[PDB]
Design a protein around this motif. Structure first.
Motif, PDB file in Angstrom:
ATOM      1  N   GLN A  30       0.877  -1.066  -0.015  1.00 17.36           N
ATOM      2  CA  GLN A  30      -0.112   0.095  -0.119  1.00 17.36           C
ATOM      3  C   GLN A  30       0.946   1.148   0.101  1.00 17.36           C
ATOM      4  O   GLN A  30       0.624   2.117  -1.032  1.00 17.36           O
ATOM      5  CB  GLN A  30      -1.030  -0.007   1.354  1.00 17.36           C
ATOM      6  CG  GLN A  30      -2.399  -0.674   0.716  1.00 17.36           C
ATOM      7  CD  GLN A  30      -3.299  -0.552   2.102  1.00 17.36           C
ATOM      8  OE1 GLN A  30      -4.244   0.322   2.107  1.00 17.36           O
ATOM      9  NE2 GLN A  30      -2.811  -1.229   2.976  1.00 17.36           N
ATOM     10  N   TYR A  33       2.869   1.585  -3.037  1.00 20.90           N
ATOM     11  CA  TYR A  33       1.702   2.251  -3.992  1.00 20.90           C
ATOM     12  C   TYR A  33       1.446   3.883  -3.863  1.00 20.90           C
ATOM     13  O   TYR A  33       0.812   4.263  -4.785  1.00 20.90           O
ATOM     14  CB  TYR A  33       0.446   1.262  -4.151  1.00 20.90           C
ATOM     15  CG  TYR A  33       0.026   0.662  -5.212  1.00 20.90           C
ATOM     16  CD1 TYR A  33       0.737  -0.153  -6.128  1.00 20.90           C
ATOM     17  CD2 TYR A  33      -1.462   1.152  -5.796  1.00 20.90           C
ATOM     18  CE1 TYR A  33       0.485  -0.638  -7.206  1.00 20.90           C
ATOM     19  CE2 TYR A  33      -1.551   0.732  -6.981  1.00 20.90           C
ATOM     20  CZ  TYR A  33      -0.881  -0.237  -7.703  1.00 20.90           C
ATOM     21  OH  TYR A  33      -1.412  -0.899  -9.008  1.00 20.90           O
ATOM     22  N   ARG A  34       1.592   4.034  -2.644  1.00 21.60           N
ATOM     23  CA  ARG A  34       1.315   5.402  -2.318  1.00 21.60           C
ATOM     24  C   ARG A  34       2.553   6.433  -2.715  1.00 21.60           C
ATOM     25  O   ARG A  34       2.164   7.583  -3.085  1.00 21.60           O
ATOM     26  CB  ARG A  34       1.310   5.696  -0.735  1.00 21.60           C
ATOM     27  CG  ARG A  34       1.232   6.919  -0.361  1.00 21.60           C
ATOM     28  CD  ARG A  34       0.196   7.419   0.796  1.00 21.60           C
ATOM     29  NE  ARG A  34      -0.199   8.624   0.754  1.00 21.60           N
ATOM     30  CZ  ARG A  34       0.492   9.620   1.125  1.00 21.60           C
ATOM     31  NH1 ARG A  34       1.422   9.629   2.125  1.00 21.60           N
ATOM     32  NH2 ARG A  34      -0.103  10.946   1.332  1.00 21.60           N
ATOM     33  N   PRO A  39       3.309   0.469 -11.013  1.00 19.83           N
ATOM     34  CA  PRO A  39       2.249  -0.623 -11.064  1.00 19.83           C
ATOM     35  C   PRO A  39       3.054  -1.862 -11.176  1.00 19.83           C
ATOM     36  O   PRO A  39       3.369  -2.231 -12.453  1.00 19.83           O
ATOM     37  CB  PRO A  39       1.233  -0.062 -12.065  1.00 19.83           C
ATOM     38  CG  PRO A  39       1.836   0.987 -12.883  1.00 19.83           C
ATOM     39  CD  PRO A  39       2.962   1.507 -12.189  1.00 19.83           C
ATOM     40  N   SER A  40       2.996  -2.667 -10.279  1.00 16.51           N
ATOM     41  CA  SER A  40       3.655  -3.938 -10.620  1.00 16.51           C
ATOM     42  C   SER A  40       5.029  -3.873 -10.710  1.00 16.51           C
ATOM     43  O   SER A  40       6.091  -3.979  -9.972  1.00 16.51           O
ATOM     44  CB  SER A  40       3.007  -4.679 -11.685  1.00 16.51           C
ATOM     45  OG  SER A  40       2.641  -6.024 -11.252  1.00 16.51           O
TER      46      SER A  40
END
Length: 137
Positions: A30, A33-34, A39-40
């Motif tokens: 998280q 991703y923040r 992405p990936s």
């Protein structure tokens, strides 16, 4: 019955997807991703490097608690892995007993007040005279 006796109640097995638990890993994904919009991608490499590292320490797994993860971090760890975890720690705001991880010295234990002087008289006593006290001099 449907899982592992009873119904995967005690959850003995680390589910199917064995990856630093879900909400556990997610807590790390998280933050990741923040930060940078990755992405990936293949940035998880620099991550697996730290995770695999802790893997060498099956002491946080048993208790399963990322609280020990950030600990493994040699305060200064490379990569931006910590930068992602820091987002988790900062979300702690939970100050633990600030006293234990010390050799002995930390602060003076002067909670109680100091003792009086070697005398009964201390507080500005009254003059008066009284039948007992005369002074004269």
């Amino acid at each position: 019955h449907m899982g592992q006796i009873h119904g995967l109640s005690p959850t003995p097995i680390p589910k199917a997807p064995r990856g630093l638990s879900t909400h556990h890993w997610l807590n790390f994904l998280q933050a990741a991703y923040r930060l940078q919009p990755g992405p990936s991608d293949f940035d998880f490499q620099q991550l697996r490097r730290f995770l695999k590292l802790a893997l060498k320490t099956p002491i946080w797994l048993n208790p399963i608690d990322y609280s020990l993860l950030a600990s493994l971090i040699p305060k200064g760890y490379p990569g931006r892995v910590v930068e992602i975890i820091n987002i988790l720690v900062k979300n702690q705001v939970s100050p633990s007993a600030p006293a234990a991880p010390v050799p002995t010295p930390i602060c003076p234990t002067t909670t109680p007040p100091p003792p009086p002087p070697p005398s009964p008289e201390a507080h500005v006593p009254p003059p008066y005279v009284e039948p007992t006290t005369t002074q004269c001099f």
